[PDB]
Subunit: 231 residues, 4 copies
Amino acid sequence: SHMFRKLAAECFGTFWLVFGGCGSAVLAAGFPELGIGFAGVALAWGLTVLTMAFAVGHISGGHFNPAVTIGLWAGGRFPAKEVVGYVIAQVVGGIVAAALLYLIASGKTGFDAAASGFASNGYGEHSPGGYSMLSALVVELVLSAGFLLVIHGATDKFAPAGFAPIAIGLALTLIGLISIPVTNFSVNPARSTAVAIFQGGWALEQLWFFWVVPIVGGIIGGLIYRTLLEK
Amino acid sequence: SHMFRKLAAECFGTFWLVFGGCGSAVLAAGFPELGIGFAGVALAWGLTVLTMAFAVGHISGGHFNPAVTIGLWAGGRFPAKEVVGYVIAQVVGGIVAAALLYLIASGKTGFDAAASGFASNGYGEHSPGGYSMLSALVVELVLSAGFLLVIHGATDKFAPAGFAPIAIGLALTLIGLISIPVTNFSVNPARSTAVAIFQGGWALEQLWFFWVVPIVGGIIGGLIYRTLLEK
Amino acid sequence: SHMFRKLAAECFGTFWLVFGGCGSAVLAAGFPELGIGFAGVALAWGLTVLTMAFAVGHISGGHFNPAVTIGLWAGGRFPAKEVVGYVIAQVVGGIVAAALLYLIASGKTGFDAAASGFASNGYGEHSPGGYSMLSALVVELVLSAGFLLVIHGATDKFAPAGFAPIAIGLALTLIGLISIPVTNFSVNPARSTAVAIFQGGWALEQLWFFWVVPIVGGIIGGLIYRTLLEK
Amino acid sequence: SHMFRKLAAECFGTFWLVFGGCGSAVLAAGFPELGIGFAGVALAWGLTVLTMAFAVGHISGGHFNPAVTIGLWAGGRFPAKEVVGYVIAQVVGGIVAAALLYLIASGKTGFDAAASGFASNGYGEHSPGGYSMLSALVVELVLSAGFLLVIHGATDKFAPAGFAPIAIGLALTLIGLISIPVTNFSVNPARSTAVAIFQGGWALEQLWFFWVVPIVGGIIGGLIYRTLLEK
Ligand SMILES: CCCCCCCCO[C@@H]1O[C@H](CO)[C@@H](O)[C@H](O)[C@H]1O
Ligand SMILES: CCCCCCCCO[C@@H]1O[C@H](CO)[C@@H](O)[C@H](O)[C@H]1O
Ligand SMILES: CCCCCCCCO[C@@H]1O[C@H](CO)[C@@H](O)[C@H](O)[C@H]1O
Ligand SMILES: CCCCCCCCO[C@@H]1O[C@H](CO)[C@@H](O)[C@H](O)[C@H]1O
Ligand SMILES: CCCCCCCCO[C@@H]1O[C@H](CO)[C@@H](O)[C@H](O)[C@H]1O
Ligand SMILES: CCCCCCCCO[C@@H]1O[C@H](CO)[C@@H](O)[C@H](O)[C@H]1O
Ligand SMILES: CCCCCCCCO[C@@H]1O[C@H](CO)[C@@H](O)[C@H](O)[C@H]1O
Ligand SMILES: CCCCCCCCO[C@@H]1O[C@H](CO)[C@@H](O)[C@H](O)[C@H]1O
Ligand SMILES: CCCCCCCCO[C@@H]1O[C@H](CO)[C@@H](O)[C@H](O)[C@H]1O
Ligand SMILES: CCCCCCCCO[C@@H]1O[C@H](CO)[C@@H](O)[C@H](O)[C@H]1O
Ligand SMILES: CCCCCCCCO[C@@H]1O[C@H](CO)[C@@H](O)[C@H](O)[C@H]1O
Ligand SMILES: CCCCCCCCO[C@@H]1O[C@H](CO)[C@@H](O)[C@H](O)[C@H]1O
């Protein structure tokens, strides 16, 4: 099974993630009177990964996330060499979603990706609820780590075969349930990028945080499972 | 196992889809103060398919959708010959639901299938939130394609056996979470028809869109898996 | 494995159903500002059965419902002789829940099981949203039938082993999503009884409907699978 | 597989439970206009356990709860000797979450763990909706018992392998759906402690209830399965 497809799967996967989990935020979360709120976005998030982990996890591993791929290298599950391909696939996928989405969102008067934020991840004054950078750090580091704690745990050799996608996608929804008000929900650098580019302002100015923190978090989780819990 | 049953399963299946996913919209989505909103409709949608994919997927394949059957032909999974039977079963099932439903909905004064829309799919002025035909196209084409990307992926030879219905039904709920405000949620020509007939106005005038777009989308997904990702 | 336990399982199971799915309605559905609405009740409903189907389905079959047991006899899955034991277990279980619940509900001033309805199932003037008896009939008959269509389908010899409880519990939540505004959600005579006794008024006066309709519905579903779809 | 890890798994597990299920309450449940309400907290709760039962249940058994560990001893599933280690791991894990959380929550002006309650469990005047201590007892005893009824049932020798985490985590969400308005939702002494320490007032004054009741409940469930239903 040639590597062009893994990339293709990681690519489509991450697009699907950014199309659904950001679409929901942008189009449905706030819709007058019948909108899906944070709950529904958190759910949507999980489901993109549930669904695509099932659809192509059996191909690429089903990461859809730079922090996952990296954090998976840290846990000794993924090879050094293949990491850079995934992270690019992942990022490029996300961008294409952010555009098609951006274009879609544009068909309804009122739309302003700048003003509105375009589901871009922020901290401090750009925390959906005004949380400090410190809160943002703790929440993203704790939740990134746990995410990969859950990924490694669920894909453990001894862990019941197949359920992994439920275990993970749901994790993400849980993470969403928790973290939307602090970071607008991230733990996925490809995702913060995809829409940061289109918000094109502060979202681009803080974007680094949402590479650095979740990646380190992903390493911290990978090492917490690999050393402490595994073997 | 004779073909009359596959049709019977596809028939009951699609009815169950249109009864639940449209019922929820019509009866519960907007109910004063405790109603289930778009979230709950999106969920209901997914669940009809989750439940009936489990209940009879083991018989017909469990399509419940003309775009699925067609898009499945495109991925080389379904036979040319059997496609027309499914699409009819699918459509006829849906209609019977739309009526029983229509009759049910009628037992509560106020009811006006014309005025209200009867959960019919629309774009532009009939987009639940006023989206352009272009937005409607992009959203339906992207989401139809992905749907079959997920169906083919989940039913892949190498993909863990049995989980498919969770993988798909949830996908649909996700699609619902995303697309209710743009198209009132479709990717299923049988479904747009079932209630278009009873709305009997603009819903019938735009119905074509919701055959053409999701079908092409289903082909595009079928070909994206079959050529790029499968083998 | 002696029969006293099947009854014990069906008994605890149905209690758990009536404790959770009616508790949610009575205590949480309407709670000021953060309450769980119909959505959350519908979910709770499904989950009682998901959870207890897993917990003891492997013992009794996991019916928790007179209409299920009967409708299962109709599909040729359950033995004639054992049906009466289940239905009693089922009913007695539910009552004990309705009381403990009733007692629990009583600890908060304001409480009036008469005034409020106590989650009792009704039609017409006692339809949560004023639906006609006809609408109530169609909705309960369609949804009872489908429920057992899904139960028989999911527990089919050829259907993937184990997933059944997800398939069913979710069905029920879906049914809840649909039918709360028409019947306050039933398809379970034991359940309508359990709280009808405590509402002690119109709920007792209409209770028959919620034996007759869902039972016939359960037969209609049992026969629809057994004759048409099975073999 | 050395015991330091079981403890480590139970430790991380319970932290993840208290981070997610209490985070959601504290940060998202009430968020203006798009917050996740009781529904979303109930969900979050379930999901922590779903996810971590999958991630490390295959290591420690995956209790994350003193009442579970104890109640599991009562059902003859867990060894006498190992119980005290789990309960400590469990408690220590939770505390670390409550702090990191507490610190996180602090980054948003307004925050007052005293005033607000900090998701601490209470009864009577500290019942989120003013329920009597009696209601609180019945609800916690019924729901603790059932929880372990479901745990023992789901992990039964004859019960389908692997699904257990869905069966349990969902149970908990169901319990949340039901019991948030009566106790602010507990059945987990480690959890009531974790945030009682930080609320540092009445939450510490009633904390005992949320050790005594759910533990006894867990025994009552363990014995109800072991004697009546198992064998
Ligand atoms: C190719 C994927 C990574 C792109 C990241 C965008 C670069 C971040 O840098 C940003 O560049 C913008 C100019 O384009 C400016 O508007 C921002 O102020 C600047 O900070
Ligand atoms: C594979 C391409 C993605 C790499 C990650 C890009 C991280 C962007 O980092 C951004 O750089 C801006 C330019 O100065 C700074 O102004 C911002 O503070 C920072 O958010
Ligand atoms: C994936 C991108 C990683 C970025 C390099 C890590 C170094 C962190 O450097 C950070 O860069 C910010 C923006 O340039 C500055 O404003 C911060 O003050 C600084 O801490
Ligand atoms: C048999 C299933 C397909 C039926 C599609 C309905 C035909 C669409 O065409 C419609 O016919 C109606 C008259 O019945 C008119 O009200 C509409 O304006 C017209 O566009
Ligand atoms: C198997 C039967 C279903 C076939 C698909 C029917 C597509 C209906 O197409 C409809 O036709 C109307 C009649 O002119 C047009 O006015 C509408 O623009 C169009 O929505
Ligand atoms: C399943 C039904 C497919 C319809 C045939 C595809 C041709 C698309 O033709 C469309 O038909 C519409 C309604 O008649 C016209 O109003 C549009 O302008 C036209 O683009
Ligand atoms: C034992 C389980 C079935 C009990 C059903 C209750 C009987 C229904 O009958 C009811 O009896 C009540 C007197 O108790 C009256 O209040 C009602 O008006 C009457 O209709
Ligand atoms: C195993 C015991 C449960 C049997 C089902 C009880 C059905 C109750 O039936 C009730 O009877 C009342 C008494 O006249 C009538 O007034 C009500 O119309 C009717 O709802
Ligand atoms: C499980 C209980 C089944 C009841 C017997 C079925 C006969 C239906 O009989 C019904 O009884 C009602 C109440 O007594 C009457 O008010 C109705 O008019 C009548 O149709
Ligand atoms: C080590 C884990 C268990 C700690 C439980 C806290 C002790 C409960 O006791 C509490 O102690 C506090 C002083 O610290 C006081 O504020 C409370 O009024 C008192 O009741
Ligand atoms: C392993 C450590 C956890 C043990 C459980 C601690 C139970 C705390 O119990 C608390 O004690 C307080 C001190 O008097 C009392 O005032 C409170 O009424 C009571 O809630
Ligand atoms: C895990 C902690 C268990 C506590 C010991 C069980 C004895 C119950 O004792 C209780 O203690 C309360 C607080 O001290 C008193 O206020 C109550 O009146 C008393 O019933």
